[PDB]
Curated annotation (Swiss-Prot), chain A:
Present with 8500 molecules/cell in log phase SD medium. Belongs to the V-ATPase D subunit family. Subunit of the V1 complex of vacuolar(H+)-ATPase (V-ATPase), a multisubunit enzyme composed of a peripheral complex (V1) that hydrolyzes ATP and a membrane integral complex (V0) that translocates protons. V-ATPase is responsible for acidifying and maintaining the pH of intracellular compartments. It is found in: Vacuole membrane. V-ATPase is a heteromultimeric enzyme composed of a peripheral catalytic V1 complex (components A to H) attached to an integral membrane V0 proton pore complex (components: a, c, c', c'', d, e, f and VOA1). Interacts with RAV1 and RAV2 components of the RAVE complex, which are essential for the stability and assembly of V-ATPase. This is V-type proton ATPase subunit D. The chain holds residues 155 to 205 of 256 of the full protein. The gene is VMA8.
From Swiss-Prot, chains B, D:
This is V-type proton ATPase catalytic subunit A. The lineage of its organism: Eukaryota, Fungi, Dikarya, Ascomycota, Saccharomycotina. It comes from the Eukaryota. It is found in: Vacuole membrane. SUPFAM superfamilies: C-terminal domain of alpha and beta subunits of F1 ATP synthase, Hedgehog/intein (Hint) domain, Homing endonucleases, N-terminal domain of alpha and beta subunits of F1 ATP synthase, P-loop containing nucleoside triphosphate hydrolases. It comes from Saccharomyces cerevisiae (strain ATCC 204508 / S288c). GO terms for cellular component: fungal-type vacuole membrane; Golgi membrane; proton-transporting V-type ATPase complex; vacuolar proton-transporting V-type ATPase complex; vacuolar proton-transporting V-type ATPase, V1 domain. Its EC number is 7.1.2.2, 3.1.-.-. Changing C260S: Reduces splicing reaction speed. Inhibits splicing.
From Swiss-Prot, chain C:
It holds the Pfam family ATP-synt_ab. The keyword Cytoplasm does not apply. It comes from Saccharomyces cerevisiae (strain ATCC 204508 / S288c) (Baker's yeast). PANTHER family: V-TYPE PROTON ATPASE SUBUNIT B. Present with 131000 molecules/cell in log phase SD medium. One of its GO terms (cellular component) is Golgi membrane. The gene is VMA2. This is V-type proton ATPase subunit B. Non-catalytic subunit of the V1 complex of vacuolar(H+)-ATPase (V-ATPase), a multisubunit enzyme composed of a peripheral complex (V1) that hydrolyzes ATP and a membrane integral complex (V0) that translocates protons. V-ATPase is responsible for acidifying and maintaining the pH of intracellular compartments.
Length: 51, 593, 457, 593, 129, 129
């Protein structure tokens, strides 16, 4: 039971580190990139209308 | 003067303008709503009218006040609550019998039935006079003469008329200056444009040493006067609590509180609580209120008054800076000031820019901070005064990526974090060395190093101990405590002390309420002293467990210093610390052996 | 005639059609003030002007004009060294009166006798972090890309105080042959920041060999845009007449861009993407053209502009336009600052296009460039491997990888860490690099030829 | 004439116009600034004046040239550096005493000081002639005629007189052509408008390789003469490096280098660099430069020049393409050309399309890439020619989804991606198979197979090694390399070697920068033989670590191979690569057992 | 809101004002403008959306004499479950806390389904006695 | 299209019109309205872009005589790659389903690379028997 416990904890430890460092910041950066383009399409339109 | 041609939405357009300038304050119609001239096309002027125009018509008169949007800085400024364009709230509460000021009702910018006793300064008939020179003073405090009457800037000449000592009305004159004929008469109150910064002899790097009486600012990353500081808010993280603390505990001459466009429930608290509260440097006569001049706009108040707010407060502080007093400027919050700008642009059809937020934003936020600072005071005596700016910022889009928070962090050299967690745990403020920096720090500590404190050495060593500890906590989580030595465990203990003694406060005693420079100094001296000996002794054959059982009485004593008087050794240098050095040395002989 | 209206910083003048483009006019205010302005637009019996002084307080028939009849030019002189100016060329600390020996108009194109032979000599500040990875040639432009929460001001300061000590050493190597002068233009910065720069020139003894132009943010937005240009016209004059290498430090670019943006959303032009100007590119281009060797071929203008991202990204319209025009960038990072590394300049994506050109063999080694290629690769892979170490542990971390982990630490704490009075030289930097690089096997070190490798491990 | 009505910015309006196209060339003032009539509004034509302006009086004459903006096509344009508005920069250095053009100036577009050598043609007296016929030639090069002089398109007739062999001037007439009376007399140079593509008899399908000289380009996805290429930037592109390569290595007869409003340093690097390097077939008269004609513009140099640059360059290309010369046209960078359209659209006030970039960007861009390609030469003689358009682009949005990049991606035939991480490590030019394509590869690979190479099989195997590497690389980072098998462990390793060795072509040699079609083949072959042998060896019983250790020295030798010159063995097919095959085979026996 | 200010001031009564739906009021404000020279801000919602919210908000608080009061609970419906939607964000800054009601609990079949997980009253202590 | 309608109607033929490239067609529409009084909507695309697509699309369907038909295959390349871009988004609505080609299959080395996961035709079952 010990030897197995020793192997499984090593895998569970890698997964926490992976989701924390890689996954979450990728979701932040991608969201942001798209946000910045997106708001500008709505704004420029209003300026076009006004002109 | 003018005649109204059209009124479209909140905006009034008026013809027969042959002499309206584009900053002028005007009273539109017969309802005398407040308005200011944004643009001029031809003989037609564009005015944004900030106060409700339901009842207003076309063909009605437009009467200029004859000057831009300005604030009057006169005497009687203390123990009054104002708006950001400045009109006494208090006088409206009595007269109108309504707390807030409703449409079409206006009052002079200060009370005018009030009379003051004017004493002369150092001038006499026929002597030459210049800007910033003290022509007389008025008391308002029984601590200081708050209103020094200075000669107006943009005014100089030879004085044809000096009134003597005696009591005069605000309307009544006391000075005439001859400078290309009669320049004008002058009165106690002088006028000053909000967006125009006062002239000064010269501005200097922010370095003037004074406390805010909150230890953690000073200890972790030296608190600065003439500084610029941003603090993150979220309107229930305890920012409002530290603002009332920051205002009381300080030893500065005045505090100017600016509620830029706030809840109004927070503004209600500052009105009432501050006269209840008592000075930490003595004085009666409504203590905190007497030292404080209060500008209060809630979020519902005209977009102009909120917009003016930050400018108007900083103007009162700069003027006093010129007087040679140290003033603290506390603003909550520049995110509400920014928002208001968005409102105005949108109402005009003036294009905003990035994130829907004005293009006007960057340059304006920057214009404001540069007014704040250390200066040598305008006029011939030459004095030092300072204005310290603390501005709260908060999300403006529900993100911290908002143009405002990110623009201000660039301009500022001080950043101090603020947390929900530490506030629930009863540490107020909430500054940690991971969410802060101060680049002003090198000059401040240096200044402190001169006076008696060993400050620079101590402070670098303090930052490092809290940093190194964080890393040592991560090991406790993963591996546990079976891979940490006596020396690493010791780092943790010292760090807990630094945090306990400085960061955690809540007004436990009238020793947390005010702390001098000396008490801050003695606390850290004690922690480093223990750190070096303790680690040395474990290297020489001792254990953390051993150190702990013997240290006992001396170690609890340094933790509790914050409840006790600092006045034990002398009068502000603490005896509980001075004796500790000897006991800690003695402690270490026993520990090694 | 007289003023019809003002819409923002645009002033609507009614006047006749006889003035020229950028002709100065003067506005007589009834307040006892004169304000100068220059024609942005000329139209059928009206003109639209941006005023350098003020931005508001302009009337209708109280306000009158007289046209100067003279287009906007800078009196550029060479005896302008040691004199202190503001953002218009008035003294604020009682530096010597401007005079005149030539007048040049500002258009980003005075006489424009910029490069058709590229730079090839080397300039070193003694900073390894900068010099090795980014080989600064005598008329290249490499900006400093930083972000909020950094001491960009401090690094700009490192350059300015350490330059003018390293350069005579470089004079002997034939890296230089001539004196150095610094022309500092500050835009839109705090009093406190402005004094810091002035403090650095005093402190060194290069207050007589520097020109300082100070523009603050509370001075008009229109004054602020003229400030870099004014500095640049002067700079070209010093280069021409007295044949010195002029380094221009133009700080801060974001402040300048905020000014352009207010004069493009208040214009009758619709601005580009993210409310930032459509000719924002152009405005930036005006500075940038004014780079390279100037006639007589021994003076030059070299440029390091300072950018702080106000939104922490290279996504933003300012970094992306800036980087295209210039030839590299020198990148500063947040992580390194937090840790206690000064200068905190990271070397991960910092790049020099004209690296090859800049290195020589009559004042630098030829191995500067070869060894650079290794450092950039190795550091880059090493930084990425470290993040990877965190995730995986030791179950996908090799022996070789452990060696990359060691190279990374050592590079950070030695190559990048040096105080603000520490001066290096190129030969020393190469030697220290060689040592770090030494633990790697021969096989590993494969982007450098066997001839080089074998001699110096 | 015209009268200048308004000068508002670079856009100038003048009344009392007549004629006026929409591309008609005008000179504004007595200064003679470059402009073009964009619009007409009423009698008044709106001209954008693209030259610098700080001193243009309103109410001066505007002179029409009477004709659209054109370039002169004739002898002596080769080995000459011009801007896009056609003014000899070399002449500008002499006259002006300034390297760049000063504003307020204009000068003729071709030097009129020199004489050129006319040699007869293939059209004698009474032969019928029709445009693009080779009337004669002028030698400009010391191995070829770079300028074969054609009769201009839409001219035809029978030749009464051909002037005899001899030297003449280029101003001097040497031909009379009869069509409908005396048609006109002709000179060596003729004009052609740049907004009119020069006609062609017929277009031919591309089939003849563009030898790019670079391994990473030949190997990953090859290009063809008659091709179209898009390259996205981010300032790690190494555009000057690859452009300099294209000029020297590409085996085209002529190369037209176009500076589209660049650094001004980089254009200066490629001018200086050509005479220092040597031609690929011998000849000196400033070697590479002798075949190279430059359009050079700088960023804040006249916008008309910048805008005209791709058009003027491509018209130059088309002329040589009708002469029956193969041409490599390098456009660097078109995104600054597109930027100009953003600017134009802004100045005018017209509404834009996506992200402020106009809609007319896609259609204009599409015409441009369509004027390039492989063709059968215009005129009776019949020759084959080519235009290969290679265009760099860049974001300004910090993504790859922005209009400029997108509109080019739509149209382009060959795409060479840019991967920021590889470039951060340095691997100029940097690509993966997933970010790049050439639709042309199939037809190219059959052609390469005839030549000697094993090219088809190697193209499929190259894609496959990179594609597998990408999938496995995600699994390694997140999960661990523990799941992976030893063959897939190998996949990462062989692929890594290809990254460092191919992509990296910056070098410090011309052997580490020029990799011939044969040198590129041997390298790729050697590396695949390794991978196949390697997957087998571990399969019948060997480790990734054990295998790696045995090849060892032999692996270093293939890495360092690239540095070695290509001029040895049979030609570039060295004995060094051939022996290496045997050593891999031997190693395979050891590794397995 | 006006009717309420009169009952509260003159005859001194504690009034709770229930206002539903602030999202429909906001839409109306975005909706008007179709010949005005007034331009909206983010997501098509005004730059002056603040101003309009404020307007409702100004009638809310203690009345003078203070035994009567006007107490306001506005009700805001997220149409797409986005807390970064402009309507809740501006309001949230002005308001003294917020009540969050989530879909998840309604789904288990709890009614009312107020998750008190991110809900806050910032003057929680101040109310009780 | 008009010629196809003549083929389908008068002589009862099965007509296949293959119409490439819609994207090029979309741009052309976009370049105009830059001096028309008619104003451009979302992402600078005309609002009557839908109307333009629908005129093209109209000649498609079984003709009367019910022995002829015109089947229409429009060819769209996504210029930005996403399917929420204006060019594809509007077209997918007018049509009854969609067919997705994908970059990913192409990379592995597949031909014709067709992903089927978002691909569905909602009138498929009824037609066929």
């Amino acid at each position: 039971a010990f030897i197995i416990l020793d192997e499984v904890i090593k895998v569970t430890n890698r997964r926490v580190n992976a989701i924390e460092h890689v996954i979450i910041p990728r979701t932040e950066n991608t969201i942001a990139y798209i946000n910045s383009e997106l708001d500008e399409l709505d704004r420029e339109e209003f300026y076009r209308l006004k002109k | 003067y003018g005649a109204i041609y059209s009124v479209s939405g909140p905006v009034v357009i008026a013809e027969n303008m042959i002499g309206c300038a584009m900053y002028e304050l005007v009273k539109v119609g017969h309802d005398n709503l407040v308005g200011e001239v944004i643009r001029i096309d031809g003989d037609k002027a564009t005015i944004q009218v900030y106060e409700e125009t339901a009842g207003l018509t076309v063909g009605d008169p437009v009467l200029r006040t004859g000057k831009p949007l300005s604030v009057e800085l006169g005497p009687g400024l203390m123990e009054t609550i104002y708006d950001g364009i400045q009109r006494p709230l208090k006088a409206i509460k009595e007269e109108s019998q309504s707390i807030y000021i409703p449409r079409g009702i206006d009052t002079p910018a200060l009370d005018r039935t009030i009379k003051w006793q004017f004493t002369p300064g150092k001038f006499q008939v026929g002597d030459h006079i210049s800007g910033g020179d003290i022509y007389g003073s008025v008391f308002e405090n029984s601590l200081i003469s708050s209103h020094k009457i200075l000669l107006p800037p943009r005014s100089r000449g030879t004085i044809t008329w000096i009134a003597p000592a005696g009591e005069y009305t605000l309307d009544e004159k006391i000075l005439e200056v001859e400078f290309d004929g009669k320049k004008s008469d002058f009165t106690l109150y002088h006028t000053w444009p909000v967006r125009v910064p006062r002239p000064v002899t010269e501005k200097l790097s922010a370095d003037y040493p004074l406390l805010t009486g909150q230890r953690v600012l000073d200890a972790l990353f030296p608190c600065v006067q003439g500084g610029t500081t941003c603090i993150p808010g979220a309107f229930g993280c305890g920012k409002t609590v530290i603002s009332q603390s920051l205002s009381k505990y300080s030893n500065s001459d005045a505090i100017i509180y600016v509620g830029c466009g706030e809840r109004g429930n927070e503004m209600a608290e500052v009105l009432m609580e501050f006269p209840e509260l008592y000075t930490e440097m003595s004085g009666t006569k409504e203590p905190i209120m007497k030292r404080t001049t209060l500008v209060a706009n809630t979020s519902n108040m005209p977009v102009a008054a909120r917009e003016a707010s930050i400018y108007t407060g900083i103007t009162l502080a700069e003027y006093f800076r010129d007087q040679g007093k140290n003033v603290s400027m506390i603003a909550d919050s520049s995110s509400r000031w920014a928002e208001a700008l968005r409102e105005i642009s949108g109402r005009l059809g003036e294009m905003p820019a990035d994130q829907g937020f004005p293009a006007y934003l960057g340059a304006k936020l920057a214009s404001f901070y540069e007014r704040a600072g250390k200066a040598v005071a305008l006029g011939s005596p030459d004095r030092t005064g300072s204005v310290s700016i603390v501005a709260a910022v908060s999300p403006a889009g529900g993100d911290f990526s908002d143009p405002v928070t990110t623009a201000t962090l660039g301009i500022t050299q001080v950043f101090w974090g603020l947390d929900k967690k530490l506030a629930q745990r009863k540490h107020f403020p909430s500054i940690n060395t991971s969410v802060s920096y101060s680049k002003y720090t090198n000059v401040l500590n240096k200044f402190y190093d001169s006076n008696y404190p060993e400050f620079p050495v101590l402070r670098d060593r303090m930052k490092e101990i809290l940093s190194n500890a964080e890393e040592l906590e991560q090991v406790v989580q993963l591996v546990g405590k079976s891979a940490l030595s006596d020396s690493d465990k010791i780092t943790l203990d010292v760090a807990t002390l630094i945090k306990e003694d400085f960061l955690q406060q809540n007004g436990y005693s009238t020793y947390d309420a005010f702390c001098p420079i000396w008490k801050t100094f003695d606390m850290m001296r004690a922690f480093i002293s223990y750190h070096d000996e303790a680690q040395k002794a474990v290297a020489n054959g001792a254990n953390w467990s051993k150190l702990a059982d013997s240290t006992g009485d001396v170690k609890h004593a340094v933790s509790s210093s914050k409840f006790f008087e600092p006045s034990r050794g002398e009068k502000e240098v603490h005896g509980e610390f001075e004796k500790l050095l000897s006991t800690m040395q003695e402690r270490f002989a026993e520990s090694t052996d | 005639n007289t003023v019809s209206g003002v819409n923002g910083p645009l002033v609507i003048l009614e006047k006749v059609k006889f003035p020229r483009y950028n002709e100065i006019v003067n506005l007589t205010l009834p307040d006892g003030t004169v304000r100068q302005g220059q024609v942005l637009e000329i139209r059928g019996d009206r003109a639209i002007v941006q005023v350098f002084e003020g931005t508001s307080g302009i009337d209708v028939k109280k306000t009158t004009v007289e046209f100067t009849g003279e287009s906007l030019r800078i009196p550029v002189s060479e005896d302008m060294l040691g004199r202190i100016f503001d953002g218009s060329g008035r003294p604020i600390d009682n530096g010597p009166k401007v005079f005149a020996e030539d007048y040049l108009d500002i258009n980003g194109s005075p006489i424009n006798p910029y490069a058709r032979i590229y730079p090839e000599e080397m300039i070193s500040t003694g900073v390894s972090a900068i010099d090795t990875m980014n080989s600064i040639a005598r008329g290249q432009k490499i900006p400093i890309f930083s972000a909020s929460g950094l001491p960009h001001n401090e690094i700009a300061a490192q350059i300015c105080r350490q330059a003018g000590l390293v350069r005579p050493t470089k004079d002997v190597h034939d890296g230089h042959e001539e004196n150095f002068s610094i022309v500092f233009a500050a835009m839109g910065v705090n009093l406190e920041t402005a004094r810091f720069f002035k403090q650095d020139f005093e402190e060194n003894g290069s207050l007589e060999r520097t020109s300082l132009f100070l523009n603050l943010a509370n001075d008009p937005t229109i004054e602020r845009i003229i400030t870099p240009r004014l500095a640049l016209t002067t700079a070209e004059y010093l280069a021409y007449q007295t044949e010195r290498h002029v380094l221009t430090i133009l700080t801060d670019m974001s402040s300048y861009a905020d000014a352009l943006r207010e004069v493009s959303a208040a214009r009758e032009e619709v601005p580009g993407r993210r409310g930032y100007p459509g000719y924002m590119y152009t405005d930036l281009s005006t500075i940038y053209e004014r780079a390279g060797r100037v006639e007589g071929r021994n003076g030059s203008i070299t440029q390091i502009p300072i950018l702080t991202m106000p939104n922490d990204d290279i996504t933003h319209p300012i970094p992306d336009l800036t980087g295209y025009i210039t030839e590299g960038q020198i990148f500063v990072d947040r992580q390194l600052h937090n840790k206690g590394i000064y200068p905190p300049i990271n070397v991960l994506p910092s790049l020099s296009r004209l690296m090859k050109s800049a290195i020589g063999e009559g004042m630098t080694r030829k191995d500067h460039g070869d060894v650079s290629n290794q450092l950039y690769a190795k550091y880059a892979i090493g930084k990425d491997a470290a993040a990877m170490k965190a995730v995986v542990g030791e179950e996908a971390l090799s022996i070789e990888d452990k060696l990359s982990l060691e190279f990374l630490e050592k590079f950070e704490k030695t190559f990048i860490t040096q105080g603000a009075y520490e001066d290096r030289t190129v030969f020393e930097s190469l030697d220290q690099a060689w040592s770090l690089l030494r633990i790697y096997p021969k096989e590993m070190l494969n982007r450098i030829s066997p001839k080089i490798l074998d001699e110096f491990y």
